[PDB]
Design a protein around this nucleic acid. Structure first.
Ligand SMILES: [K+]
Ligand SMILES: [K+]
Ligand SMILES: [K+]
Ligand SMILES: [K+]
Ligand SMILES: [K+]
Ligand SMILES: [K+]
Ligand SMILES: [K+]
Ligand SMILES: [K+]
Ligand SMILES: [K+]
Ligand SMILES: [K+]
Ligand SMILES: [K+]
Ligand SMILES: [K+]
Ligand SMILES: [Mg+2]
Ligand SMILES: [Mg+2]
Ligand SMILES: [Mg+2]
Ligand SMILES: [Mg+2]
Ligand SMILES: [Mg+2]
Ligand SMILES: [Mg+2]
Ligand SMILES: [Mg+2]
Ligand SMILES: [Mg+2]
Ligand SMILES: [Mg+2]
Ligand SMILES: [Mg+2]
Ligand SMILES: [Mg+2]
Ligand SMILES: [Mg+2]
Ligand SMILES: [Mg+2]
Ligand SMILES: [Mg+2]
Ligand SMILES: [Mg+2]
Ligand SMILES: [Mg+2]
Ligand SMILES: [Mg+2]
Ligand SMILES: [Mg+2]
Ligand SMILES: [Mg+2]
Ligand SMILES: [Mg+2]
Ligand SMILES: [Mg+2]
Ligand SMILES: [Mg+2]
Ligand SMILES: [Mg+2]
Ligand SMILES: [Mg+2]
Ligand SMILES: [Mg+2]
Ligand SMILES: [Mg+2]
Ligand SMILES: [Mg+2]
Ligand SMILES: [Mg+2]
Ligand SMILES: [Mg+2]
Ligand SMILES: [Mg+2]
Ligand SMILES: [Mg+2]
Ligand SMILES: [Mg+2]
Ligand SMILES: [Mg+2]
Ligand SMILES: [Mg+2]
Ligand SMILES: [Mg+2]
Ligand SMILES: [Mg+2]
Ligand SMILES: [Mg+2]
Ligand SMILES: [Mg+2]
Ligand SMILES: [Mg+2]
Ligand SMILES: [Mg+2]
Ligand SMILES: [Mg+2]
Ligand SMILES: [Mg+2]
Ligand SMILES: [Mg+2]
Ligand SMILES: [Mg+2]
Ligand SMILES: [Mg+2]
Ligand SMILES: [Mg+2]
Ligand SMILES: [Mg+2]
Ligand SMILES: [Mg+2]
Ligand SMILES: [Mg+2]
Ligand SMILES: [Mg+2]
Ligand SMILES: [Mg+2]
Ligand SMILES: [Mg+2]
Ligand SMILES: [Mg+2]
Ligand SMILES: [Mg+2]
Ligand SMILES: [Mg+2]
Ligand code: NA
Lengths: 73, 175, 180, 260
RNA sequence: GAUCUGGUUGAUUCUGCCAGUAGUCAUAUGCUUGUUUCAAGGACUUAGCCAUGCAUGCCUCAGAAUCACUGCAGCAGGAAUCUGCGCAUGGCUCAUUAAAUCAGACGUAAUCUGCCGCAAAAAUCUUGCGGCAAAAUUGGAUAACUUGGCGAAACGCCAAGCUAAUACAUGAACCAACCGGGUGUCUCCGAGACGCCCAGCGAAUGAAUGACAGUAAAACCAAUGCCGCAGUAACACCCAGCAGUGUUGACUCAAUUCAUUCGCGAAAGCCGGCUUCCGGCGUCUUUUGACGAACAACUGCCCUAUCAGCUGGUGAUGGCCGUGUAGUGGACUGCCAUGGCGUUGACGGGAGCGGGGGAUUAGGGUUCGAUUCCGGAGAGGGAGCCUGAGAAAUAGCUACCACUUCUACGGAGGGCAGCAGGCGCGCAAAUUGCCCAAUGUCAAAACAAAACGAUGAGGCAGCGAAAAGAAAUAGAGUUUUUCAAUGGGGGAUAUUUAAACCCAUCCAAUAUCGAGUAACAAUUGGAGGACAAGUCUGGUGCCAGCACCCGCGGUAAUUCCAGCUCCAAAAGCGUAUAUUAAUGCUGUUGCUGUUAAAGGGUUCGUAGUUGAACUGUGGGCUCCCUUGCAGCCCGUGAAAGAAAAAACACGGGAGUGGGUCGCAUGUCAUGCAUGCCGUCCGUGAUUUUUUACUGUGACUAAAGAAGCGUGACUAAAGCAGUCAUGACUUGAAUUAGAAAGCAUGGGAUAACAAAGGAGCUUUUUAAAGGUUGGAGAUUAUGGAGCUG
RNA sequence: GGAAGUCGGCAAAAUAGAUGCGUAAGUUCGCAAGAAGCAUUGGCUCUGAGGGCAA
């Protein structure tokens, strides 16, 4: 996904974009989803960067993923 | 509750109730074959449409398609085994040419009449219902029985009927 | 009673959740122990699966380890000095995991002489053990005073015991500054 | 919690008619999984026809007349499964539960002196108390001192009479395997290459005797011999070779015509 | 079967609606019903209220009988009670409910887990005798019962006296092992002996282990090994190889050592077979498969803006140390920060249990799904809880609210959305029946024998034109009378069935009833048009009435009320209300907008939708084109080398280190042992490309749909059966199922991201500085890289 | 008991400080508003926050 916000402490919001297909009209829609991810101090991502995340045990009310790799800009 | 025995439907009414041409054509068949009601004709209509619908689907597929090979031979085999088509007809395109009288010819009621066991097609109907006809030593009382070509020569009078070695009006006359 | 489910919380959208089932036994919680310093008193609890948890209400003794020496000894608790959650827990002398306590230092001094031959065939081993070995000044000063700071490592409300480890290194200097 | 099993929900391989009753016998926990088993009451009644109903099935079983892996079983809900040996000494019967080429259970008759051997697949390895290595198999056995070269996925040749390991077959390229799950169940092939995907499922590429190629997940294979020519067990009469559906239909029709 | 017809005008050509038409396991109602097979059945309204009866218990050879119980001759059967297991399943219903439940696909390394399978087990000073011995001859209570009873009763109670255990409690030395840690007195020159404390499974805290995988070769010192540095797993004797080697994608996990600290019988049990040992059961603790439970969430899911902002005192989004839980977690206390969601529709309001699936059908679609299988939830409403492996249980307990029953007035009870039944409500839905024979569940349990477990789950009949399949009401002749034939029905040596019933067989096998008006008598709607069929004959006279629409009826009615005749469907046929097609009148495929309804008064403009070209003809062989063979450094240049995965290093890598009988070593040997060029595998340093689309493959409950085979007499069905002390090595084949998720081949059309073009050498020599036996220290010589 | 007294609630009774939450119709958009209404408050022993001046 892509980094959407970095205002929390050691937590970021990422966004996933995809196209959904409607069978009746034979055409697509644009949709998106948001996730909260824990970000270790070993990384320094910025808004707009692309990250790779992995699933882990529940860490808070909304966090279920950890950042594994950052691809800058 | 919790009963899983299946059942379905075998006939459908025409969608124009009073069409002059259709009414006359159907009254021809009832008199010619001695049927009881229009429902017996409409039953034959559904079987033909099922066969023709299947054939159209297969003929769309390419010849080397596996499903066309297996289903195509299966439906042709069934048509030959029941006398709907003669063995000369081999391609799958000839099944689309089946008509209503083609199937009505194979009914047991019209088979026995043309075989010489009955004076008329109405005489054939009562004989079957009265347990006088046997197909391969088996009594059949269903006029709509469809006979197979390999079973045509086995049709004769039953062994328990007076007409062939039975009788184990005359029974009540002598008392 | 007390529950641990998320059904009563708000959604991230801020909207309210409409509940359509009753509370289940598989999501209960229980009241805290609030273990305090005093003469031993415990109460067993029957937990899921038929197992037992020991709920400690009062404790005054425990097992404490000297990490650099890789040994342990049973000593008495003297006081609770620091708690990172709240000052009210120090005031009431509440024993919870990771709080700082002061324990009796006499058994450690006694072991030091028997193992090193120092007072704050066997003689030859004592010379061997002394080689490449020194003692931190900060630890040594506490032993002469009679009390030494330690850190609780068990969970008294879950297991019913209060074990710990003596503070050394930079961790000791951190808490000494907070105390004064 | 669940104690019943509706007949419509039972596995299709048991061959139970939907019109006969509402229920089917629910197998107990045991050596084999519920979805991959054949309960004893089904074997003695619907398969061997020694019992006409459940009442007669109980008389035979509760007397201890049926042995599984050389041990009497008195429970009709016992979950028998793949590779087990069933003996009825009073009638001189010996079978092994296997899969035929269409994925159904098949009872292969066993000669004597080979009813003492069972193949087991290793599914886990761990250390017990006292540093004792232990291997746990697909049928729930625990072997407390396996061969040192054992690895997860290998096959152990086991003597049920004497309770001891006799040989080891390693999972390697060029061995003979049989498929135990999926759409290729019951087919016998030759390991061409195992593709490894960490985290995901590994994929095994196989090739039967005729040269046909197929694949499946690595957890569904079961080593049974060194090579396709020399197996370590007797397989059903198809030898695990799947034939074309059109060809099968023709031959069955031809044989039927010749049968009369 | 990819179809249309009547109604606007004096006529015509349109737009457009109204009416007609066919289906519905879609309901109700009306008129009619001879035979047979197969079936739904108080969901809709009132998750309204309930009289009565029944729906969950279990004993074998194998836990405990002194019934003051029964037979016969102590044996056998055994009422009642204690103990062990189960009652958290099955059955019913659909009220609540919108990232909640559910579907496909995943996770628990975040956890608990009785019954079942395969396994494990060396702790713990007891008993008898008076120091000696060893098959451990352990202890105290309680029911049923007896006595006295209380109370109107109550699935209500009190006291005393007796006695079992697989209930409860206690408790086993020697036989009997291996290994380690800490320590006192003697013999030797640091070694040895002896003495002492502790050393079991599980649990808690602390300290270690849970591998390595890259630059070479020397000296000096102390301590050791072997002969001075050649062999060389490790180890001061018993053991000269008794672990130098757990698993995974990954672990603070499995397991082991050291220190300190706290549930575990050999049931002190029960039966047999052999003549003392042999078998079958039963049970405590530890461990991990299986059957489960609980939590989490990748994509998807109706209408509404006359609902635009929502959340955050008092948890809203995150952080730190804790608490609680079986476990993760704002689940919760304290402190800190200011976040989190929203026109890609948040928040609010409305109607709904979710799927598998049903109806309709050219295709695309529209619509239904309370209801048999799977998942969820509830037991009048609302909370709370004990027991238990598992319940926030309701034919369990506690309280309140609303209803309600008995009473001697003191008190005591109740929960049919289980099966039958009532009352109400409504347009709307059966018998207070028989049985455990089949299918299953429980359990101390095979069946039999003195000797039959329960089961309204379930099955079988009754009622039952919801719906579905087959099929009578005659046939053949002769001039208006002659022949046969058969069922409906009545019966039966009988068959079926748990017993009955229905179906099937028969009306002599010596021996067995019956059609002529075959009264054994077919109905429901119509006859101007749409739409098949009368310009008939009476009555009425804009009345009565018909008419879905157009329209008839005012004295000659093709339409009303009747009689004749005729038409359509037929054991069925009308009517009402919904819904699908008809409908290209919701239009993606596929509508219309000058005048029929409908382009905004004109511009600017943000989300959004859409968006120009280009990096590319391979060539030669037997002028372009067709075909086919075989080779190209497959533009140009330049001959192993440049030219367009590479380079390292691991023996704990490869079923000894993958392919290309006796001679030695060892003998204190169970050494019984040993030898006669590119690929594997794991690690480190360097490599710079997705998505979408398309082709294969993998993974995907049945029932339902499609479909192969099969003369249940045919068919709706079903999965069976066919052929000769048994064979068929019998059969029960295949297919499709949205979207999302997994692996991999292809690169034409496209999408995402980046950039905005002046932030833009290679190699070869030379010089300068800055493994030594092993383990523990010291130093130096060089690699390799650093500059000049 | 609570306006039945009286021409008439005259007179008397009643509300009451401060702090937190909360607050309708109407409107000249300023108000209405202290609208209405609910809750806390003592004593003692502690804890936290809010500063200046020199190295
Ligand atoms: K007109
Ligand atoms: K008995
Ligand atoms: K009991
Ligand atoms: K033991
Ligand atoms: K009494
Ligand atoms: K935490
Ligand atoms: K009822
Ligand atoms: K039964
Ligand atoms: K019935
Ligand atoms: K019928
Ligand atoms: K008759
Ligand atoms: K007239
Ligand atoms: Mg995994
Ligand atoms: Mg007009
Ligand atoms: Mg005119
Ligand atoms: Mg009707
Ligand atoms: Mg009959
Ligand atoms: Mg009858
Ligand atoms: Mg119902
Ligand atoms: Mg109701
Ligand atoms: Mg229950
Ligand atoms: Mg249930
Ligand atoms: Mg699922
Ligand atoms: Mg002992
Ligand atoms: Mg006990
Ligand atoms: Mg390891
Ligand atoms: Mg060793
Ligand atoms: Mg463990
Ligand atoms: Mg959840
Ligand atoms: Mg707060
Ligand atoms: Mg509802
Ligand atoms: Mg439903
Ligand atoms: Mg409803
Ligand atoms: Mg259900
Ligand atoms: Mg419940
Ligand atoms: Mg009720
Ligand atoms: Mg229990
Ligand atoms: Mg309850
Ligand atoms: Mg009840
Ligand atoms: Mg009284
Ligand atoms: Mg109640
Ligand atoms: Mg009805
Ligand atoms: Mg019995
Ligand atoms: Mg019943
Ligand atoms: Mg029932
Ligand atoms: Mg009649
Ligand atoms: Mg009759
Ligand atoms: Mg019947
Ligand atoms: Mg008339
Ligand atoms: Mg006409
Ligand atoms: Mg009508
Ligand atoms: Mg007249
Ligand atoms: Mg008319
Ligand atoms: Mg429509
Ligand atoms: Mg159309
Ligand atoms: Mg239009
Ligand atoms: Mg206009
Ligand atoms: Mg204009
Ligand atoms: Mg373009
Ligand atoms: Mg060239
Ligand atoms: Mg290598
Ligand atoms: Mg008052
Ligand atoms: Mg007055
Ligand atoms: Mg006044
Ligand atoms: Mg206002
Ligand atoms: Mg105020
Ligand atoms: Mg006012
Ligand atoms: Na908090």
């Amino acid at each position: 996904g892509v980094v959407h916000s970095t205002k929390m402490h050691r937590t970021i919001i990422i966004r996933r974009n995809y196209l959904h297909f409607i069978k009746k009209y034979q055409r697509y829609q644009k949709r998106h989803k948001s996730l909260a991810v824990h970000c270790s101090p070993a990384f320094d991502p910025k808004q707009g960067d692309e990250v790779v995340i992995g699933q882990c045990r529940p860490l808070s009310k909304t966090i279920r993923y950890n950042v594994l790799e950052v691809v800058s800009k | 509750m919790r009963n899983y025995n299946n059942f379905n439907r075998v006939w459908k009414a025409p969608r124009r109730p009073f069409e002059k041409e259709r009414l006359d054509r159907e009254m021809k068949l009832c008199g010619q074959y001695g049927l009881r009601c229009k429902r017996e004709i409409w039953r034959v209509n559904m079987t033909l449409s099922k066969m023709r619908r299947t054939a159209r689907l297969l003929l769309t597929l390419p010849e080397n398609h596996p499903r066309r090979l297996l289903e195509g031979s299966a439906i042709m085999r069934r048509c030959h085994e029941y006398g709907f088509l003669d063995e000369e007809k081999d391609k799958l395109d000839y099944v689309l040419s089946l008509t209503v009288p083609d199937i009505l010819e194979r009914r047991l009621q019209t088979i026995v009449f043309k075989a010489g066991l009955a004076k008329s097609v109405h005489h054939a109907r009562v004989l079957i219902q009265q347990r006088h006809i046997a197909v391969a030593k088996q009594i059949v009382t269903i006029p709509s029985f469809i006979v197979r070509v390999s079973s045509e020569r086995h049709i004769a009078f039953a062994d328990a009927s007076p007409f062939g070695n039975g009788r184990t009006r005359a029974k009540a006359a002598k008392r | 009673g007390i529950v641990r489910s998320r059904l009563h919380k708000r959604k991230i959208t801020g909207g309210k959740t409409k509940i359509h089932r009753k509370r289940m036994k598989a999501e209960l919680g229980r009241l805290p122990a609030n273990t305090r310093l005093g003469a031993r008193r415990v109460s067993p609890v029957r937990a899921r699966g038929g197992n037992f948890k020991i709920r400690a209400l009062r404790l005054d003794t425990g097992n404490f380890a000297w990490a650099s020496e890789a040994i342990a000894h049973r000593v008495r608790l003297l006081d609770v000095v620091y708690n990172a959650t709240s000052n009210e827990l120090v005031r009431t002398k509440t024993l919870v995991k990771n709080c700082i306590v002061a324990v009796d230092a006499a058994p450690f001094k006694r072991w030091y002489a028997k193992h090193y031959g120092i007072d704050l065939k066997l003689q030859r081993e004592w010379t061997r053990r002394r080689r490449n070995h020194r003692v931190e000044k900060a630890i040594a000063d506490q032993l002469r005073e009679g009390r030494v700071l330690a850190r609780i490592t068990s969970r008294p409300g879950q297991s019913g015991r209060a074990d710990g480890i003596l503070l050394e290194g930079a961790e000791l200097q951190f808490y000494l500054k907070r105390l004064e | 919690a669940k104690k019943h099993l509706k007949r419509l929900y039972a596995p299709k391989d048991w061959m139970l008619s939907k019109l006969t009753g509402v229920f089917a016998p629910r197998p107990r926990p045991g050596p084999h999984k519920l979805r991959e088993c054949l309960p004893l009451l089904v074997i003695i009644r619907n398969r061997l026809k020694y019992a006409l109903n459940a009442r007669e099935g109980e008389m035979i079983l509760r007397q201890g007349l049926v042995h599984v892996d050389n041990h009497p079983r008195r429970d009709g809900k016992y979950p028998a499964g793949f590779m087990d040996v069933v003996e009825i000494p009073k009638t001189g019967d010996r079978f092994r539960l296997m899969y035929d080429v269409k994925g159904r259970f098949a009872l292969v008759n066993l000669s004597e002196a080979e009813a003492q051997i069972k193949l087991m697949k290793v599914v886990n390895l761990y250390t017990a108390t006292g540093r004792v290595p232990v291997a746990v198999t697909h049928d729930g056995h625990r072997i407390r001192y396996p061969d040192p070269h054992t690895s997860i996925g290998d096959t152990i040749v086991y003597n049920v009479k004497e309770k001891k390991c006799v040989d080891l077959i390693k999972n390697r390229q060029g061995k003979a395997v049989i498929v135990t799950g999926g759409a290729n169940r019951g087919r016998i092939g030759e390991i061409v290459k195992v593709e490894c995907h960490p985290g995901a499922f590994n994929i095994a590429h196989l090739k039967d005797a005729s040269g046909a190629e197929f694949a499946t997940r690595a957890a569904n294979i079961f080593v049974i011999g060194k090579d396709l020519n020399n197996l370590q067990v007797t397989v059903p009469k198809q030898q695990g070779l799947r034939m074309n559906v059109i060809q099968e239909r023709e031959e069955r029709l031809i044989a039927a015509e010749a049968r009369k």
